[PDB]
A paper describes a structure:
Pinoresinol/lariciresinol reductase (PLR), an NADPH-dependent reductase, converts pinoresinol to lariciresinol and subsequently to secoisolariciresinol. Here, we present crystal structures of IiPLR1 from Isatis indigotica and pinoresinol reductases (PrRs) AtPrR1 and [name] from [name], in the apo, substrate-bound and product-bound states. The crystal structures were captured in the apo, substrate-bound and/or product-bound forms. We found that, for all 16 structures we solved, each enzyme adopts a similar head-to-tail dimer conformation, strongly suggesting that each PLR/PrR functions as a homodimer, consistent with the literature that TpPLR1 exists as a dimeric entity in solution. Each structure contains a head-to-tail homodimer, and the catalytic pocket comprises structural elements from both monomers. β4 loop covers the top of the pocket, and residue 98 from the loop governs catalytic specificity.
Known exceptions are [name] reductases that have substrate preference for pinoresinol, but only weak (AtPrR1) or no activity ([name]) toward lariciresinol and are thus named pinoresinol reductases (PrRs). Each of IiPLR1_NAP_ + PIN/AtPrR1_NAP_ + PIN/[name]_NAP_ + PIN forms a homodimer, and superimposition of the protomers among the three complexes revealed RMSDs of 0.374, 0.365, and 0.308 Å, respectively. In contrast to IiPLR1_NAP_ + PIN, the β4 loops of AtPrR1_NAP_ + PIN and [name]_NAP_ + PIN can be clearly identified. These well-defined loops twist as an “8” shape and cover both the NADP+-binding and substrate-binding grooves. Within the twisted loop, His93 and His97 “grasp” helices α5 and α10, while Val92 and Phe94 interact directly with (+)-pinoresinol; Arg95 strongly interacts with NADP+ as well as each of the GXXGXXG motif and α2-helix from neighboring protomer of the dimer. Similar conformational changes of β2 loop and α10-helix can be seen by comparing the structure of AtPrR1_NAP_ + PIN with that of AtPrR1_NAP and the structure of [name]_NAP_ + PIN with that of [name]_apo. Although Val46 is unchanged in [name], the α2-helix and β2 loop from the neighboring protomer move closer to the substrate upon its entry at the catalytic site, further condensing the pocket. The relative movement of dimers between [name] and IiPLR1 (as suggested by the ~9° shift shown in Fig. 3c) could be induced by different dimer orientations. Two molecules of the dimer exhibit relative torsion in [name], and consequently, Val46 is forced deeper into the substrate-binding pocket compared with what occurs in IiPLR1. Therefore, the entrance and orientation of the substrate in AtPrR1/2 is more tightly controlled than in IiPLR1.
Numbering used by the authors:
A (entry chain A), B (entry chain A): 6 to 317
């Protein structure tokens, strides 16, 4: 007995998307994944979808170029979760979600939509410079379309994926931690929020039918993972029994020559500046009633000493 | 007691490469995987490498742009297996292997090199037209460099990956089988050789220290998977209890307008022409002493009715 929750994951072969599919299956949701014809001859995408089908997910054919196919897909479910791309060095197709919003509005049966958020809260980032500002402006365009359409929502925000900021000791251009030398942004004593991307997906699956988070922004701030960069580096130094040689990088030097860099690097520099120099993930307080680890305390989130162990 | 085999897989995060890593671990080889700095911020590549490390593989840092780093990597092992890219719609970087050949020659300790073959035997394909001919010409350039350097080798050839030709009933542009209508090349009665890409990797791990295949071409021809396209379609019709509407495509119509197509499609058309119209995978006899399933009869290769089941 009890209400059934059917979930359509749009973006199910993405980095976060594939973890959201797994987490929805594990949570017991009836889990559907969009199978786009445009994935074409991409063997990794196709075989990810088949792997979900083996685990009990339902593949639903549809294309963002075919409005009625999107309407037909979302009519099958109660909740839609979008994990649309939003990283300049990957692809950055956040605005394609406008077509999904229009399909949800027409279908009328969707109880909640979670758009592709899962990072810095775009509503706090009006000051950002281009091209990094595209991430926040495009995500706000989706939020505005959600509001105009009257679609119920949850926005899950507020943490750095450990893959991109934690396992590499926040060194740009690599996802492996350095062996001898490390660049520290500023004095390294600005608190950053880290979360295992797997746990971001677990909180997605927990929150998407939680009445407490209807039409709310939910902040992901795992207490033990609120760490300065120096604290993160010290976790690694303990695991490896070795001190790294530290270079402290001023804000002025961090941003030097930014106009001459590749677009995706300019975006990265801007995001890193907000996180590590401005402390944008920790410069505001949030209540327990809107923070993921307090709402879902049964998720035993991965701490960064555990995340880092496989790298040593 | 007995000789230890250390294997370096170069290309370990590739479609075939990741399966070769898995198969080498399963075979009991001491398994090393090249970790290139150029993989950069690619989370899927990095996390594949870490997944191998969790299973007991050894990550070895090196770059094709750093000759001495390649020499140092290959000095650690007895056998090198390259799964370098070679598909126009993915990347086609076969010639980068020349740098690996030079490093192997200098190192001097490598007992065998398996270059990135794993498809049509390039030595049989001199007649191919550009741009598809690039695949065969570039692979022959590697073979010629191997011979000039005196490096011992095995060339594993002769079968279509089920992912690209079997699970889709050989329909171009998709990896899913069609629901109602199917295009048949010619009369559909030309034998093609199909192999699960997983089993191509198993035969790689079996053959790379087999004295019987030293300096040999080894053909992968699983008897139950030597199928015409009509036979493949009939397997699917049986699984789905439904007949597909067949359109028979002449060679002339298959190649029509080829000069106006995108390069990667022109390459695909050429390869499909050799396989399905010329029967290039079955127009020559091979001996049991050079055929993978007879050499390694303990590999219970996947048949195409099993491969197709997850699609219905
Ligand atoms: N540290 C942090 O907090 C981070 C936050 N993020 C945020 O996470 C979210 C997801 O990012 P990520 O996982 O990297 O996304 P990916 O780059 O993996 O792309 C996700 C999905 O987007 C779909 N997609 C891309 N282009 C199109 C298109 N033109 N039309 C239709 N679908 C398309 C695809 O779906 P399909 O599977 O159907 O092919 C793809 O798998 C973003 O909002 C991002 O900003 C991401 C990185 C780090
Ligand atoms: N039906 C059949 O028989 C088929 C046969 N094949 C053949 O299989 C082989 C592998 O193909 P596939 O698995 O699709 O390959 P992928 O496209 O997956 O690429 C394999 C690896 O190539 C490496 N690579 C690519 N570019 C470079 C570069 N510039 N420098 C260094 N390394 C690079 C990468 O290694 P890293 O992991 O280190 O990043 C990558 O993971 C090819 O020879 C292909 O022709 C492939 C398709 C079907
Ligand atoms: C933390 O919030 C976000 C993070 C991100 C990050 O995903 C990966 C990118 C982007 C910001 O900086 C990351 C990055 C960019 C360039 C690099 O060289 C890099 O190296 C690790 C890492 C995107 C959107 C967000 O709201
Ligand atoms: C079978 O031998 C090979 C096959 C291949 C194939 O890998 C994928 C490509 C290429 C030939 O045709 C495949 C392909 C190309 C275009 C398509 O639209 C397609 O759809 C399934 C499939 C490459 C090298 C080979 O020696």
């Amino acid at each position: 007995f009890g209400e059934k929750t059917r979930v359509l994951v749009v973006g199910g072969t993405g980095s976060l998307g594939r973890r959201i599919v797994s987490a929805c299956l594990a949570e017991g949701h009836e889990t559907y994944v969009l199978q786009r014809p445009e994935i074409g001859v991409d063997i990794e995408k196709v075989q990810l979808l088949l792997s979900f089908k083996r685990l009990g997910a339902h593949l639903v054919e549809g294309s963002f170029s075919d409005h009625q196919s999107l309407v037909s897909a979302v009519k099958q479910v109660d909740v839609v979760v979008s994990a649309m791309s939003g990283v300049h060095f990957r692809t950055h197709n956040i605005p394609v979600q406008l077509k999904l919003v229009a399909a949800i509005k027409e279908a009328g049966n969707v109880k909640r939509f979670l758009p592709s958020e899962f990072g810095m809260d775009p509503s706090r980032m009006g000051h950002a410079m281009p091209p990094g500002s595209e991430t926040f402006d495009q995500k706000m365009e989706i939020r505005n379309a959600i509001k105009a359409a009257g679609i119920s929502h949850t926005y899950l925000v507020g943490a750095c994926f450990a893959a991109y900021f934690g396992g590499n000791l926040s060194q740009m251009g690599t996802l492996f931690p350095p062996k001898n030398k490390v660049d520290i942004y500023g004095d390294g004593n600005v608190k950053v929020v880290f979360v295992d991307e797997d746990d971001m997906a677990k909180y997605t699956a927990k929150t998407l039918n939680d009445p407490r988070t209807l039409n709310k922004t939910v902040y992901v701030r795992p207490t033990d993972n609120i760490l300065t960069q120096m604290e993160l580096v010290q976790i690694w130094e303990k695991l490896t029994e070795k001190e790294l040689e530290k270079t402290y990088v001023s804000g002025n030097d961090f941003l030097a020559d930014i106009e001459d860099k590749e677009i995706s690097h300019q975006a990265g520099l801007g995001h890193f500046y907000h996180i590590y120099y401005e402390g944008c993930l920790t410069d505001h307080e949030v209540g327990d009633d809107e923070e993921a680890t307090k709402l879902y305390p049964d998720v035993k989130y991965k701490r960064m000493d555990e995340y880092l162990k496989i790298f040593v």
